[PDB]
Amino acid sequence: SLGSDADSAGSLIQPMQIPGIIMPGLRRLTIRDLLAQGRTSSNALEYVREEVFTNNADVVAEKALYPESDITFSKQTANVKTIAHWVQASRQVMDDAPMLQSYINNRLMYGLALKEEGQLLNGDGTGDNLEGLNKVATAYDTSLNATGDTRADIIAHAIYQVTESEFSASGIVLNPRDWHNIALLKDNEGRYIFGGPQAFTSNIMWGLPVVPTKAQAAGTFTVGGFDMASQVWDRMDATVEVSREDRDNFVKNMLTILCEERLALAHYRPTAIIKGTFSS
Amino acid sequence: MPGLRRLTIRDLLAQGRTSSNALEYVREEVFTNNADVVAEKALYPESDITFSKQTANVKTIAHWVQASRQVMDDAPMLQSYINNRLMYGLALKEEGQLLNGDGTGDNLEGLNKVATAYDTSLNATGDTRADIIAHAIYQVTESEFSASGIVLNPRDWHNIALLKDNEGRYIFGGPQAFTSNIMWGLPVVPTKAQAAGTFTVGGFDMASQVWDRMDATVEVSREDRDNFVKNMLTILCEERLALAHYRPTAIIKGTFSS
Amino acid sequence: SLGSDADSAGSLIQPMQIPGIIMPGLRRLTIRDLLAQGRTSSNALEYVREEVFTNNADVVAEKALYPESDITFSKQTANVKTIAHWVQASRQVMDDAPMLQSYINNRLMYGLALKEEGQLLNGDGTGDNLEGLNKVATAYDTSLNATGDTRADIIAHAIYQVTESEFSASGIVLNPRDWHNIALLKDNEGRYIFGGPQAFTSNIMWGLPVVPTKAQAAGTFTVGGFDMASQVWDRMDATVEVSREDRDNFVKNMLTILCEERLALAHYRPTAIIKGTFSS
Amino acid sequence: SLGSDADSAGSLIQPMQIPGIIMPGLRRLTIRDLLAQGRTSSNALEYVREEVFTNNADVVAEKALYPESDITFSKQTANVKTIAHWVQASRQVMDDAPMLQSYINNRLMYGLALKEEGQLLNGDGTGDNLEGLNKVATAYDTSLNATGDTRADIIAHAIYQVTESEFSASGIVLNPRDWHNIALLKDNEGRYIFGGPQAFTSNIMWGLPVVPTKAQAAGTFTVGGFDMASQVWDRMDATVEVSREDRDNFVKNMLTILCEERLALAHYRPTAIIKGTFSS
Amino acid sequence: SLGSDADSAGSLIQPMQIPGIIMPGLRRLTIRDLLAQGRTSSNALEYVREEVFTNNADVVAEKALYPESDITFSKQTANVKTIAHWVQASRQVMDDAPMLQSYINNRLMYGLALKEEGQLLNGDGTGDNLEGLNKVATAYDTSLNATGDTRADIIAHAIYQVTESEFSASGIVLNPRDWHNIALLKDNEGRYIFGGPQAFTSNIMWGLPVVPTKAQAAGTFTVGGFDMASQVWDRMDATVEVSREDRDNFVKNMLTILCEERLALAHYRPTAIIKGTFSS
Amino acid sequence: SLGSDADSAGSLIQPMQIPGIIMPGLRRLTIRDLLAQGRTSSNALEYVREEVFTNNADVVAEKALYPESDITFSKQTANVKTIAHWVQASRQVMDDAPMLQSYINNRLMYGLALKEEGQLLNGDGTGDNLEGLNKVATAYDTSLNATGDTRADIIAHAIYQVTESEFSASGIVLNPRDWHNIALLKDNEGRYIFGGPQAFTSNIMWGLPVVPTKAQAAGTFTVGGFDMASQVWDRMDATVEVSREDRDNFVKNMLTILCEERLALAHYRPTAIIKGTFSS
Amino acid sequence: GLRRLTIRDLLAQGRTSSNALEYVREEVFTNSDITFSKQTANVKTIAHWVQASRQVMDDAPMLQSYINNRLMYGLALKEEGQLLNGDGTGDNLEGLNKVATAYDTSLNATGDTRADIIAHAIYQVTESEFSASGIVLNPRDWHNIALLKDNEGRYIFGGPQAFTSNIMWGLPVVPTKAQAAGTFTVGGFDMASQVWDRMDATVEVSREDRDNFVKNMLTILCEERLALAHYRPTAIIKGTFSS
């Protein structure tokens, strides 16, 4: 009998290829689009912020000596760092896969922009590592915690701590898993606070937009007025340049694709940022 | 005239028509992302990528019945009925594979087979059955994709839409009204195919696609084997399918602890 | 003294007559309106219903033996039964009272059609009786019950068991006293479940029409796809024919009135019908 | 000193007369306005109701005898009773008080019209006394009362009992006090069933009009389709006449004021009326 | 050193005067504006009310003697009382502070009008004291208080008792403090009955306007149809006169100020007014 | 390797200067904008308020002795005080940083105005300190506390205390932290009083606006009709003068900047302002 | 094809467009009330396959003409094989020996022969209020009948000169091989039980049935579906040869 196995027939019917490739899960970048964008052209940035304001204004009695108040200033600096990575491949492949080139670019960008968001959130500040939000951010005041408070109360408590800097909040950042267990909070009767199975609710909390990014650690969180509390300064937009002559690539018939970018983070009002830790 | 109902699964996935023996597609396997911070005049990080040629074969499903040609030609009304029964019966098994496909031999790679295991550590103390399904919807997000639908054993879904709070009220609408087939804004399809006690969730809308080679068609034959001699009639109902799994990470399978 | 007493002049005044006749509560006709209506011209018609479907459809390889599926069919016979009753009356009264017969006629239809429903529901199926729905219907799955269930919870379960026959549930049948009690249901907090204490909810439950007929025995319920499952076949419509000449009627100057009809109940799918008993 | 005391100068001035007599609470006339009103000119009314319909419709056997059904007719009667009363007074006072007569008239009418309701409700039926509703009304079925039922739950049951007779219930009657205690029911939660303290609830219950009248004794209720269950026939509308020459009146120089009214209460369908006692 | 001390030169600058006297709070007069008003010019008022109406109206048999009914009336009086007070001051303060009498005049009118309510409400009725409302008000029916009743639950009962008179209530008067503890009531869950903390509740209860007045003793309350319950008659509006020659005022160069008013309260229908006291 | 460390070549790139200075959190002032304002020209204010009104207007019998009523007036004074502070800086720095001057001026104002608010509330009222709103405010009635009351109940209770002067409360003042916990109040079921987490809660309570200010010490609160309870008087607006010859400034090359303001607070009706403390 | 006598021709021939039909029949007797018995009559089918080589079939067009007729006859032979003897299953039919009335032996006389006993069976046709029609026997038995003589050696039917065909006592005779040796049946068929034809005797060929283009074996099938209706079981009588 004429089957379809390699043994007999079947070596004629070629499987119809599916146009293009299957790109994996693309994390929704948001952190960048949260802070103010800046366009620099130098190596570093120097700014000045009022450090200590010793106010002694008081009720001075008649014909007496007035109070002497003092003020302090500091020069906080923000250095420019660089993020990038390269991937060398065979030119033999590139010539056969036309759309491969334009693809790899769409990847390295995501791959880079990912670590971009990664640093921004938790920058060590150690040497080359940037100084992320969860580094400078003022710690959550444990005093605000009361008897029997849901994880939701804590967040609300945080939003307040922001107001202690006379500045209004802009958004809330959490680990998707944590935010999940929150949307499922139930009252003493049974009903859901946000949900109610028949339909699902949006990512809003106390009028403030919620942003659940996997970049955030499981247990930690952040709240503040990002759209005015800090600014990201771009030196060089994410560019992708290719080289056919890179070192011994000419002799090996290979292209060395590169994707670089120069950034710099600035922390104006650190008092408007809060980093806490969920207890359980 | 016999009527049917909704509750479709084939409609839940991407439907495309083919005309070949199989489908060759490529997917990004292991992406070695090493992008990081780099000191001045230092050597940059090297990253790499991996690909695979995942193939999905075109299998065939069908069945037949041998009846008396006499009863058929004398009462042609029964003809159309029998046909519609097989069409319905086959379609039931169409889902049979899609859900629990052995993946081995001739059985297709069922969703449950390819599905990523449910996270056991998510179930908290004092959770209901709905709380679980909810957890699953999140598991999908771990793939960076929006969940599309939900599939469960009819008996299970039944005892679910009937849950009540401490006050006593019904969660999915009071008895005065009907109980819509939706959860958290997501459609739901209860089928016997799904085993009692198990469940499935994912972004079927674009996580996996079904490829139809030959639509379910029924054709009869007067002549065949015995037939002519035993004045029999062989009715056949066939359908050539092929299932492909693009993003397996976007599908979960678990079990209730009740 | 001249009074209105029968002894005195009270024999002169005649009480004012009131037209028409006070016809007792006319029950609302249902059931028959739920089933499919068909007409015949025979004494009976043998139908066939799908007994056992043996599905065996499975995947197969090339040069493979296709699977065989079997479907068992139960041959059932639908008999045409006859219902009626006669009334012997004085032909003298008929002449003295015009629209009397016009009344008696429209009175027997109700009397007859009453048993019409009385059979279709609780048909004994014993010889001269009809194979009633409850007699045919499959029993309720006592296993579907769960701790804490209410009366409503049960009916809900039934609607599901209908789906097991691969058929859409049509309506619900109950004894008024039961249905009434059901509507007046309360939660663990207090308030009513249907409409409220100010509005009596309509006859709709779980999105399906509810039919309360005294015909349905108390503590018994029936559910299914009536508008598609079983069909009723009419041989002779409800007709009334009278005759002065008959037995000794002509001699006693009597007139016997007759009202009859010929029905036939079909059951294409019992699985799609459930009957259970309310536990108290 | 001169004071307003009688023993002083007080007897000089006179108090300012206040035009108008102080009529007590004019009880809101109801019931009659509810019941279907008619009009006759005789002294009695006769109607006919189907007493007993002996239905025997059943399935028929092969070549056998048929069922014999029978019916009963009763000539229920309703007499025309007379209600009235008279007041006797001095013809002297009448001339010294113009508006007096015009007042008495407006009183006797209300006085008579009051006893009118009084009969329609609790009519002894004792010969002369009219056959009140509560007399003919079908007793409430006790076996309908469930466990843990509110006073409202009962009335709800009552409604149905009318439907058990195949009729349109339309109207509720009870002692104002009872209605009050009812409209103030609270759930195990606390909230008021018929609207919070914000506003007083309307006299609507279960989509049915509510009529709280003092006529109805405490712990007694009535339900039905009064707008069709019974009809009141008027023979003599309430009129007022006076005679100065009546017997003694002339010589005693008096005057007699008369106020008569010939009524007749008909009870077509008693089955459509219910009366019960409250479980206190 | 030349400061503003007393021992220094500070005793030169005179502080800026603030024209206008600081008149304390003014209790919003209400009572008087509630009930109907009018005026007379005599010493008392004699109105006529229907005392007893023996309605013996009943059913009468033919050729029988109709029932005899009788009526009764009683002339009720209403005495005109006087209320006032005087203030004695020196003319030395008057000529030196012109804008004084102009003040006191507009202060005594208030002072008097204040005690005006004091009588209208808790009117003793003994001796020359005016017969207030609470005194004449029909007692409260304690036989209405059920088990587990709220304070507002009681007031509701009162409103009903107005129907006992066959009239409609048009107001509810209570001590502000009591009313406060009422509006702040909550169910067995916590939710406020009169509205969530967001917005304050209006002075409405059971569709009837609420009137909080300090004139009402704490724990006491009143309900009725004032606009048709009782009318106030004025003999002389609030007047203010002064005398320098009053008694020994001349030989003391003092001045006596008077502020009198002649009132008279009449209670037409007392049955439509209820007074009571809270349990706690 | 020609890098940009510092010793290599980093000494060539000058950091991009960030225009302007980062000013800390700017506390939104409120208190001052709550009271009526008006300028003066003296150094003290005198007002006269009716202390005790001994009213005795009672009912008087005919030809009797009228009641004597007395009145009292007090001369309450209000002193003006001065608040300020100075800053000593190098004349060199000034000439090197232009905008500095304009900044300091704009910073001293806020610095001063801060204590302005700080005094108006917690004014010791002792030696030179102004008689702050709290020091004057009538103490809260401990008797207005019901069983199981939340902080939310108390605030409402306070509003009533204001009504004990016949005035309306203009607003509510308290420490932000305290108000925070209040906004997060839950009922016995566990739900939120002001708003579900999905939504945001406004800053109003019982129709009255709420004003949170750090100035208010934690655990304290104030309520009343401020708009006309007290008035602020400005002798001299907040101005800023500068001297280059202050003391030894011409020898040390220093420049002294001063920011002063002459304020005077008056308290008309104290009985319309309440202060209290939470006992949680 | 001149044929002989067909048992099929002995019954009234009608037509139908159904799969069956409910009839009515008599059973018990009394004279003057009678009794009945009512039931249905189902339609079955008859035929037989003929596996032959297409090779020779196309070598002669006029060949299939004969092949066809050879089957048309074999069809009738199998037809009469079940008409007399039928189980009553979905394949078989309700046979005559099932709806027959055994011979009343008491109608015998002393000094009778085989020729007398068959005429005795004719009288039993009278006790059904009907007339006689046909006679059926085994060819071998009938052969003995025609060759019968008396004690002296003389024929009954007469010499060879006197002879028409298959008749006896003015009634037709159909000696079929279907009737067992020593068995016989009689009745008034022309008016007793009749037959209705749904589909006439039509043949339909197939180049497909298991082995066709596998061996060039084209199988021919001569089919026909009819229906036998029984009205009077008393008008039928079956017996045996006692000697």
Curated annotation (Swiss-Prot), chains A, C, D, E, F:
UniProt-reported outcome of changing residue 259 to S: No loss in the ability to form cross-links
Cross-link (Isoaspartyl lysine isopeptide (Lys-Asn) (interchain with N-356)): 66
Domain of life of the organism encoding this protein: Viruses
Covalent link (Isoaspartyl lysine isopeptide (Asn-Lys) (interchain with K-169)) residue numbers: 253
Localization: Virion
Full protein name: Major capsid protein
Organism listed in the record: Enterobacteria phage HK97 (Bacteriophage HK97)
UniProtKB/Swiss-Prot annotation, chain B:
Source organism of this protein record: Enterobacteria phage HK97
Gene that specifies this protein: 5
Subcellular location: Virion
Linked residues for Isoaspartyl lysine isopeptide (Lys-Asn) (interchain with N-356): 44
Tree of life domain: Viruses
Part of the whole protein covered: 126 to 383 of 385
Lineage: Viruses, Duplodnaviria, Heunggongvirae, Uroviricota, Caudoviricetes
UniProt-recorded name of the protein: Major capsid protein
Covalent cross-link (Isoaspartyl lysine isopeptide (Asn-Lys) (interchain with K-169)), residues: 231
UniProtKB/Swiss-Prot annotation, chain G:
Extent of the signal sequence: none
Subcellular location(s) of the protein: Virion
Annotated disulfide bonds: none
Domain of life of the organism encoding this protein: Viruses
Residues joined by cross-link Isoaspartyl lysine isopeptide (Asn-Lys) (interchain with K-169): 216
Protein name as catalogued: Major capsid protein
Lineage: Viruses, Duplodnaviria, Heunggongvirae, Uroviricota, Caudoviricetes
